[PDB]
Design a protein around this ligand. Sequence first.
Ligand SMILES: [Zn+2]
Lengths: 621, 75, 76, 406
Amino acid sequence: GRRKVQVSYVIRDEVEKYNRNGVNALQLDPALNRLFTAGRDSIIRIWSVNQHKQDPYIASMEHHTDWVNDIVLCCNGKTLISASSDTTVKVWNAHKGFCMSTLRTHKDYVKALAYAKDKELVASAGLDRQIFLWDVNTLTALTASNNTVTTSSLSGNKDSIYSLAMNQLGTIIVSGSTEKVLRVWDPRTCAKLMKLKGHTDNVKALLLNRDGTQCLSGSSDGTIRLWSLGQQRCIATYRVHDEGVWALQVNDAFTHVYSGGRDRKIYCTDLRNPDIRVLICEEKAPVLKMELDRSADPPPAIWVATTKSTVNKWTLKGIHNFRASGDYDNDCTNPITPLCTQPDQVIKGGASIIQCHILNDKRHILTKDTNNNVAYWDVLKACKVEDLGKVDFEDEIKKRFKMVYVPNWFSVDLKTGMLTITLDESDCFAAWVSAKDAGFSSPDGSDPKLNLGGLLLQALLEYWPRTHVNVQKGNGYFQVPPHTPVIFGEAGGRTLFRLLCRDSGGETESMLLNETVPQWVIDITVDKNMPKFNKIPFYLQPHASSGAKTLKKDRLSASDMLQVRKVMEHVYEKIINLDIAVLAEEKIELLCQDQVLDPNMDLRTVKHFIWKSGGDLTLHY
Amino acid sequence: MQIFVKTLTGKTITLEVEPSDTIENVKAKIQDKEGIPPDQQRLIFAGKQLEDGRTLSDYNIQKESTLHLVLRLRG
Amino acid sequence: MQIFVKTLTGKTITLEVEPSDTIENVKAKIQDKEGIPPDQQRLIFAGKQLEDGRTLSDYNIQAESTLHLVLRLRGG
Amino acid sequence: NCEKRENLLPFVGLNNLGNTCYLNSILQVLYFCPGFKSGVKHLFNIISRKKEALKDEANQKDKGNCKEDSLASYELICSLQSLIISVEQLQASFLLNPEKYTDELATQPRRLLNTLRELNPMYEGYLQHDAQEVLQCILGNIQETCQLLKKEEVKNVAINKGEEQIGFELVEKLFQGQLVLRTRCLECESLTERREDFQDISVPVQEDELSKVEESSEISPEPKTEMKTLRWAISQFASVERIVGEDKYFCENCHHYTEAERSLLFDKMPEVITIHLKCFAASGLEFDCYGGGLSKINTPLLTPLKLSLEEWSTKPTNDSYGLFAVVMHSGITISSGHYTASVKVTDLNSLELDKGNVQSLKEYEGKWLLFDDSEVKVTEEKDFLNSLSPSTSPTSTPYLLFYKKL
Ligand SMILES: [Zn+2]
């Protein structure tokens, strides 16, 4: 009936000031001269474009649990609507900096948003071949009492939608998808109007003019098509790019188009006559989205979002000067000089983690950033230990090679440019580690066996009121930092809830947590039921070189946490015998495939390293 | 490590595996994703059948490797 | 394996067996599924009479093979 | 007594051992592959020379490790060549004078069956087995022997000289080809491809139980109606497949589960293309999980006598292919049935023994046959093709198609 619920959490600092991955969308509010970045790191950051400001940062509002494919700033720059790949479209508040109401109606990665300023109508198309028209006036009025909105929908698409556009008047909506066909509705009546054909590949950029009688399409095949919706046919094609086109912009007069795609270059094309074109700049990464400066005509500068973490503003002054130069280079052998060399303004960005390696103790991770810097994290404790810096990754791996084995109990995914740990019921409690091995020492010297997955999940919800046992909180061994996100998202699908660790202490988050979290988390977090113990069967036979006669093959069984020292002590006491540990070490040798086994090296370690066979483990004394 | 499998109808499906899982585990995952019992199905990689019991490393199977899936037409 | 059991009346009976199964087991299954006693069953393949102490493979009996079953009556 | 008029074709069937219709069909198609007989003859010549040399030097050499794995790999080629020799000798004897063979003309392949059943334990007894699987086992073992021989000769060593290199890569040069596993992420447009070998093309066969339109009225109903031909099935195998939804490609270039377009491309083409029809089906539903919903698609595809993989080949393929043999399953389910080969006897000019060791048989040139186990009957081209069409025969559903490069 219900799908698989995976609990995830992210290791990150309290504030991620700079971008930690590429930036997917940009929106500019000329009333406040603010800039919104929709980073691929699942964070929305508000900048201050004013050049004289030393620190362009203002604030952040982070609620998405995956990529932020597209954002639209609505209600004269008061409310922000963002489409994310966590199958949700949200309702932020740009002036305040927080999210009000989340829409989970889509059932796949939402990839686009379209805004109709006159009617305040916003559409949200995604990878689930669905279009859901919304009214911002109704959306921003969502409250606890009224949290259900009729899901105004459009039908006709048969392929995952990658782009969406609505004219300002809100009378035409065009969707571009892998179907390579632009399906046009009439949002007032939802009736299908026409299908536009001609694009030979996926279309990712869509623009519409004021009256909705013209459209601009940016396709992944590297061509631009101007659609005259009155005749339901294209009127001009712009083969200006070499590689694909993923971002489009156009001025108010709908006269010049600024395209930018995979080949990291941005041009300005006269829609009337595309013979003239000026290279705005050559970026250091493919361009994903742009946002013109609409405070003047012609636009003074264009903001650009790349696959890198740095956001660059490029100056458009002198475009008329460049066009008046008369440099009509009819020969393609002459490369066009970029209008700008360096960005006029830079928004500093961080480094994205691009390579991950988890050490055999399955507690530490060595992550390699895009600055080639390597880090040393701690999944259980959720904290960075040492930033080793620019040292060779493989050599650092071999330096930190361990001779112990711990079964896999999570997975690491760097989709958001940061380090995220996902826990699944199937394998989360497969790892059991001795207290001394884990690094926690009891005052009396006792060594309990702690399930790392359960010990982590207890701390992930330490503030949860149901978990306070009558006051004992969490697990009592460590404390994951409060600003650490916790995500309860279904397997390979939507996300049900996201909250910081300290959010559980409140009311509304507490009320939603009981419904959102699945039962198997309650199995340990609240019920305090110790999970299953894995067991090992093994064989004990006398060694050929020992000289003793072959004894009966006894298939003894025990736990994986049993040290080889205990087995060898039992063998010494019950075979050859028929203080003790030292004499057994000096007299009795246990060998698997005829090699001495470390007394402190455990049985599952033997299976993984020495036995190397699908049969039952064999031990010889 | 992610491998593809060509189902009976011809559409590919993706599986999350490791280089150290036997063909039985792969067949169980394909059963989960399609419903064919593990004993009935056969897997072909690089023009050779995946004998049950053997792991995945010894077949030099890496990321982006496709395992064609067929049934047993006995006669 | 499927073998067509044909009597003198033109009736074809399908029996699922294995070549390792003996002729006596085949006759017992025929009795179970048809009521004809094994003693009354006379099986002829390629002009050869089957012996209950042998198997289908011993007499080289194939699949979908028409075997002339002759009903033997004790008394008359 | 004159229902068949005691007419026996010169071509030799094979007396099945009770349930070896699959194996017998596979041996009968393999017999007519172009160069397979010569390749196995060359392998036997090499094996015999090595065996006699080892026998001669066994006394001189000490501590001779004669592992039985190599012995069995050698024995498979031994039995295959013995069976080929016996079949050809009986064919020649019948051709010279057929009075002694008034009944069916066939040779028992006991040796090769025993070799397989000791080589693969699952052939024990007299059960029923997939013909494709038997072909795979035979070809794999032959390739294993060939690569072992190549490694041994390389270790020993270290106008046209290609005659000695004809047989060392028989399976490689006959059945195995090369594929390109091209995958294109749709979020970053980065093409990552793999290069995997192949020997058979696992072509899908689809029953009308999937891809059902929810409404077919408000949405566009359907582009066109067309009887599923072999070109459509190959395209389904090796054309752009948008991986969406429950399964998404993980692009290491962007570290996300992104939609991808997978397209398989035919770079290197083997001299014999095996097309393995998926006449079986899961019926969509599992039948309330009653041990899987196994099913068989009794309605065949419109398989043509010619093929051209240019539509799915990297380089422009100027060489076409031609059907010469088909293995047909004449049952109603997959757990049982009567396998029957159907080969086109041709290539008589090149149908010669290996050099390392036409008009008489031209009477059947370019004519199909129906090797029904020990019983052999000739079927003309037109009626055979008509029976191949789904309208006529819902029983003898084709299973394997072999195409030889022209
Ligand atoms: Zn990608």
